[PDB]
Amino acid sequence: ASELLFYVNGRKVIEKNVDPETMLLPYLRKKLRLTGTKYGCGGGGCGACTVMISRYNPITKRIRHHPANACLIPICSLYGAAVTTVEGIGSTHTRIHPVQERIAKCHGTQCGFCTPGMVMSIYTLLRNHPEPTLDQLTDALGGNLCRCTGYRPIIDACKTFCKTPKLFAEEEFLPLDPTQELIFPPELMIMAEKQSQRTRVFGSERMMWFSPVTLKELLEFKFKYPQAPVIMGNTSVGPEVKFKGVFHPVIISPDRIEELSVVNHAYNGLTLGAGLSLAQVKDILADVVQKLPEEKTQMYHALLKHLGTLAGSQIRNMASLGGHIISRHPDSDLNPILAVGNCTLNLLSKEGKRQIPLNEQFLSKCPNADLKPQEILVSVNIPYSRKWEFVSAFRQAQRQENALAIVNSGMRVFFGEGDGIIRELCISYGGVGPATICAKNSCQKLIGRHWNEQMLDIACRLILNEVSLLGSAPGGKVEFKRTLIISFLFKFYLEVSQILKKMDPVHYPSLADKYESALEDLHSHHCSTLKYQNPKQHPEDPIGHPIMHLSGVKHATGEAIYCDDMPLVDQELFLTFVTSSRAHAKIVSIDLSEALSMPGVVDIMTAEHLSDVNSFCFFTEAEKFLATDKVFCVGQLVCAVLADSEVQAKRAAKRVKIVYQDLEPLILTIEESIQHSFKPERKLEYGNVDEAFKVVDQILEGEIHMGGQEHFYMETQSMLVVPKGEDQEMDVYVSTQFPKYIQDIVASTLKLPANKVMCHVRRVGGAFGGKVLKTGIIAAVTAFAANKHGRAVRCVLERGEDMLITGGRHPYLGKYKAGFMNDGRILALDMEHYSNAGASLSLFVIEMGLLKMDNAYKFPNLRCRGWACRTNLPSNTAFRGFGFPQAALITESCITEVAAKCGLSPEKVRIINMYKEIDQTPYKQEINAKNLIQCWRECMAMSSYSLRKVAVEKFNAENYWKKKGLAMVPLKFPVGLGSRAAGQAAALVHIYLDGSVLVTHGGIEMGQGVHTKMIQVVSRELRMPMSNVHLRGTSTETVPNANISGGSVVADLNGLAVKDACQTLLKRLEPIISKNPKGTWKDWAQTAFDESINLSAVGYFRGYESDMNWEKGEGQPFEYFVYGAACSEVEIDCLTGDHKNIRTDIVMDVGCSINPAIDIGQIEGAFIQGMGLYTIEELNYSPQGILHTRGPDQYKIPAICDMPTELHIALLPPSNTLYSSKGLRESGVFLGCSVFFAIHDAVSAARQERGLHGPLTLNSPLTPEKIRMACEDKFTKMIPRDEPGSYVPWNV
Template identity: 65%
Template sequence: QDVDTSQPPQDPIGRPIMHQAGIKHATGEAVYVDDLPSVDGELFLGVLTSSRAHAKIVSIDTSEALKGPGVFDVITAHDVPATNEFYYSSDPEVILARNEVICVGQIVCAVVADSDVHAKQAAAKVKIEYERLEPVILTIEEAIKHNSFFEPKRKLEHGNVDQAFETVDNIIEGEIHIGGQEHFYMETQSVLAVPRGEDKEMVLYVSTQHPAIIQEMVAASLGVPANRIMCHVKRVGGAFGGKLLKTGLLASLAAVAANKTSRAVRLVLSRGDDMLITGGRHPFVGKYKVGFMNDGRVRALDVKYYINGGCTPDESVVVAEVSLLKMDNAYKIPNLRCWACVCKTNLPSNTAFRGFGFPQSALVTETWITAVADKTGLSAEKVREINMYKEEEQTHFKQKLDPQNLIRCWNECMEKSAYYSRKMAVNEFNKQNYWKKKGIAIVPLKFPFGLGTRYLSQAAALVHIYTDGSVLLTHGGIEMGQGIHTKMIQVASRELKIPMAWIHFCETSTTTVPNACASVGSAGTDVNGMAVKDACQTLLKRLQPIINKNPNGTWKDWIKEAFEQSVSLSATGYFRGYNESMDWEKGEGQPFTYCIYGAACSEVEINCLTGGHKNLRTDIVMDIGCSINPAVDIGQIEGAFVQGIGLYTMEELKYSPEGVLCTRGPNQYKIPAVCDIPEQFRVSLLPSSQNPHAIYASKGIGEAGLFLGCSVYFALRDAISSVRNERGLAKPFALNSPLTAEQIRASCADAFTEMV
């Protein structure tokens, strides 16, 4: 991204500035919750989780656990002073199971001891007697059979679907199963709860995306006002949506233990326990019926999404809503009916995850696009181009859309990737090789930005100027590695017209910025940036008379004079949020503020004998408006894309018939490593793009790139298709996600696979 030559050299906006804590991250000096020094008398919490998916708790015997070395107490539901069940919907989120367990991994009790080892050893000695309850529902198919769903079910309809099906040349039906995904943040769930010793005050240091919900839940569980609970977040070692409600339950558990023992309590989950307890991305089953003409034009679509929500609602209904709103991806579908049902099962509740339903529903869309290409004999990219939004349109929920930059991204990606010449080279390679095949695919992206309602996108900031001229900046956003604090310092630097080095961000805290909304939905920079800008402009307005009187003075001169004139050097800033809304009864609304566009082309090579593959090259073009920090933003695009590779090709969660997660930890659960990064990885930003709706014409970029990882999935499909064509196998073939080595090998059918 080129910076305008008229921009002052000291203005940092639009420049590729290193993440403020980047060096600390690399050297290990960055401080996370479990790096905080021990508090005098600190205790540790070891949790005991249910071993049954659905059962009545007959008894809990803690006698042996209490005899363990260093054990102080065992915390059960009876020890929660006030609220143990949080009703954010009709089904509660529970701190500790009281009479019944509804999944393997639900916390039943916790042991407080003088060390982490002693706490875990004692927790293993707690004996729980269960009585099995029926039914035990683990899969989407079982939930459908038992009619086990969370309400409400959602539906959107546009045009006349049934009539359109009567006039098309072809109709095909199919389905795809999309597996879940573990967040696998580097820092597991962590909290340190420290009682103040008076007025029922408690300080919490938590790894969370949402300090305000932690404050609210802890206060409710202890039965005290929120003003007695102070929540501090320096930084979070990754979250991806996984540190919201579940973190609130764990923080409340630590607070209950700290309250009962009057000692500081530290709770840091092991990787295995974290994966067992917290849930992740929702598994989907997408069932589609699509009607289209012989020239590839799609005229009608009827699609149903079944979503495995787990045992409690958490964010699942909202995920279902977003999956419907964003399911069209880049395509204009004139007659459309889509449904989403959240299945209630006996698995740990699934929750928010980067992309929030879009990576699943859009993969279903790209699957039937590919099926249309197979049926018509057209190339997949041709079918995509035919059906892509091309001019100002209304979406299937009647929101206006200008796809100009979508087309620009697609065309530029085609050009930069040299798609057609490389496709010819891939075909030539495949003719020359029998046991190795290459594949190539290009996929477009339309990712609407928005949280659906105004109050979820409000933000506040607090800026202090000290008499030495240094500035302390605070806002409600959470640093999770995405560089929000770096960008906020850039914003403050531009507005105050001082170097970034003079500005410091300490931490996010409920004591400085109350009632802050969660850092979710790619919105952190958009909303907090506006609040920081507002606060800085307020301060500069106060300073302006002093600056006008002494235009040749320095910043320090002006601040010293302002203090001597009793000018307030502290200001709050506020952003009311975007005017977004959706009427589900009418099936229309304005739930989004703008769209991020993009396209990705990926080339792969598979080994037909092993099912293994190499990611050879990926070209990405993204429209992210005017980037505030292209170095950070390109890093976000790259990271999201690689996480998408994991979702669509590698990361597979496996459960036993009893509902026990078998893939706990990196030995069994494989996430992308260095060898999975494309050998050539080229990311470029669309030039000359403006976004009038966000801070400095930028766009929120945290989530959008993840879906483009499916370009690898479809490149793999292209390679498999080449194998099957060469061997005379049927053209229509089904693939599910993740497209693992096992599935690739099985799809390259031969005498060996027939033996299985």
């Protein structure tokens, strides 16, 4: 009966009889046609959908701005609020906001998909702090992820707002004018002033929605429907609605109630309302801790500590304090702190008040200590701490912030009257069970003792017995979680014993001098310096200048149309998939009865509904689209649901009942695949290795496992397929790298010639090799459904769907046997490569692995073999580097292992085995490593290595629980394809009679700025400004037979083709230009038309020569080589497992950089993307082959907190390639292994100090789980281990 009223970008939005299940993000895109707000992960952890919510409090007569993730906001909770998006703060046709101008001109945009989320977070903070500090801007960006830029240029644009040769002119930016910001909608200000007390009712055939605005009415609705939840920020029940299958028919969402948002400063403590956001709570707590004595602000400091690492700024501004308490998440960062300090909950019912204490039985949800279903939570009381009362909190996750904790804790102790006896003790642990638990029995048996090491050792063995984790505990990391429970107890014993030493120095002893570092927290500060070249060239020649990405400001204003950003075409249908839920089973039955009858369902297709066109051959062996009778991995396509809307599609997909029968064997690991026919072998040999194994001093055998990786492109798999209605013509609009492949698989599926199926790609929001084979499979069945029903079909996958259907990087296993002498030189090296290929096969990864395994080391006697292994996991795809980040790591791991057996640092072993200036590769190709040795020497001097190596050794000898590490690796990245026909590129250039030029080519813009570089080529070869040239996109209707747009040579090859078409046109026009050199380009093209001169031309480059005889093992497959070196420094926490990237120094040989701004961004992004591959990015698989994606098992990519605090990049000064340039987008990924060995060196320093000589086999990724378990101590051997065969683990 009620209406919905709110504002978006100043325009009024009225909605009559709304579906209460409607979320803000799909409403902005599908109903308001505001495609700037993007979809990233749907869980609220990416920040791609960041918007600004604005409310007016009529009591304070002030407006409150706060950011929020639109993908979790129901629109019924926005009554009277004003939403602001990217399009609202500015656009190209009106005024560009300085936030949009600076984040784009600082080259902080590559693919540009995450940019709208970055812009809104920066804009919202500048609306709350017009003169901010960099600390405030980085904390706002803590909830925003990016896969391309590495966060460095976004920080540079943020520094522009602070009153604290370059790639951008900061002096030309608009000063942030605070006078002409967006005014708050005055209609809402009048609405709030009239405190209407009527509750609003929104309903549909599925759900009713009640928004009481008075406390009296709210208590009435909570009594009518006790089971109905009380939605506040929707950050706990929202995510459960999507992926956890929960559904609530009744929903209560109170508006701003004055009784629910109370903050009072009492005498015994403070009481905070349950309606306050966690961001507001930290603001009143950060205010009181600098106003009150430190003896009473003990509890609030522990809360402020974890509220700083509590998710991101958007989720903190949505989640409520009461919602956090009632949610009772097992991995809660705030419940263990509140449980140990006698907190009470002010419950209010319709019958009367009630006050229960927040204790153990409440968090365990015992009904006696819980809330009655009729009463709400109004406020919580947090008392002041007393003298000689001390409380501390701890946590540990995959990264420092915006990551669910593996194990966190809160501990409070009380002595009283100033003597070292404990009178009260209360400790709690989270992430160790289904609910937050307190060791009430352990704290009981310890009351009365003194603070000392003799008590602590009995406190451990007592706690370890009480809080027990079975070997099969969910979340995995059981041996890691057992240690974090002890280590937090050790850090707590160290902290409060230091507080006693500061207050009563005479009675208590001073702590151990080598133990003080354990109390310091690894907290960041972000500095960056970039060096590159910058006379005798025309000033209108744009080659070599840091030109901004053409779609840069379009990325910043949301006007950049991505695939799903395309307007909904008439009568289009949505297609969702149901995927396999077993890793290896037989499909015994598929029940489509209930799903076919559901609303909106048009058709559901299984394997039999495709008949003969269920298989396409990728020129090795045919792979099937939909599963037939068996499934071979989880996430394999089984059915395709086709419905009128996206929502109705997934609903029917969840009602498809599929029965299975598991099969044997269930192959998961590499070795499990090696146990079971014939496998195509590949090998290269140099010299004789068997003869060298008898003339070397030592022989070292070793191996290293390496985990996989997810592409995690910010734009998930998206495509729209539109039949024309004539001659079965079909236009596909796909986010892909290989439009020709999409054209082939769709034409083959539809049994049509290629000339009837065209493929159009304007831009892709990141790809990294993950948008080819699986994307064509989805487009095949999507076009099949489109042609069958004569309608346009759109298929966009969610994040959870995407990671499960798409593969990723190939997990590697490298066995090696190295013959070497004591001087560090390696003579004999036998190598075996193994790649976890997945369900289907992959040879090219093994090939490029063996050819690039040598890196910058001349192995005189080398034998290298490789294989690919079928497993019951999703089939992986080629990534950045094409196997190089794996083949070069196992050699560096080998070099590090012989350095331990030789006693020399790994850096000395690397330089001893390095190539000479002129040398020969294992495949008998000569190299000129003159730039290779020069990169190593300048990186040593630029980073001041030896001065920092001795300082790190000084730190390791002075500190016991904190260690530092330092490492430097060289880089030789060979660039080349298989044959000349694979490097072939084409282009098409038009010149209109007004002088303007339209160019198109076979390359795909994925963020590497290929289009920007092509316009730079047109500008030089035709002597016209780029403003005269324009490019729309890539289409098979213009440039046929285009090669895949993946790798380093995409811009190089297409740059030569565009250069060929411009020269062809320029030669036809030479008579006209010579006879009138003063005239413009307009009268040149006009007289060309008058003289019958053709102004259209095709560009073409046949490709670089490339050959390789894989039988002999010799060949010339690489056009050029990219050289470089990287040096990284790390400080690790020995107790927790935490680490901090301190400094990284990168030098690269790019030659003549065609665009130094774009090329440096690719170096940073490749390094950060590689850094995550070796440190934090971890894929958790179950023993049944099911990928875990909820809780501490969540996949995490590098954030801002993970970027090194100091980053230095220098481009080595400088002809077969275009303009003497070098493609380099895949090089820096391996340079991200410098931090891996920096952590490896620091772990060695902790093992050497404690005397633990032996095999330090650290596998990739070097997660905090592997870091801490390598630093063995008394707590390591104290944990209760489990026997291997008793329990079925949660992971591995």
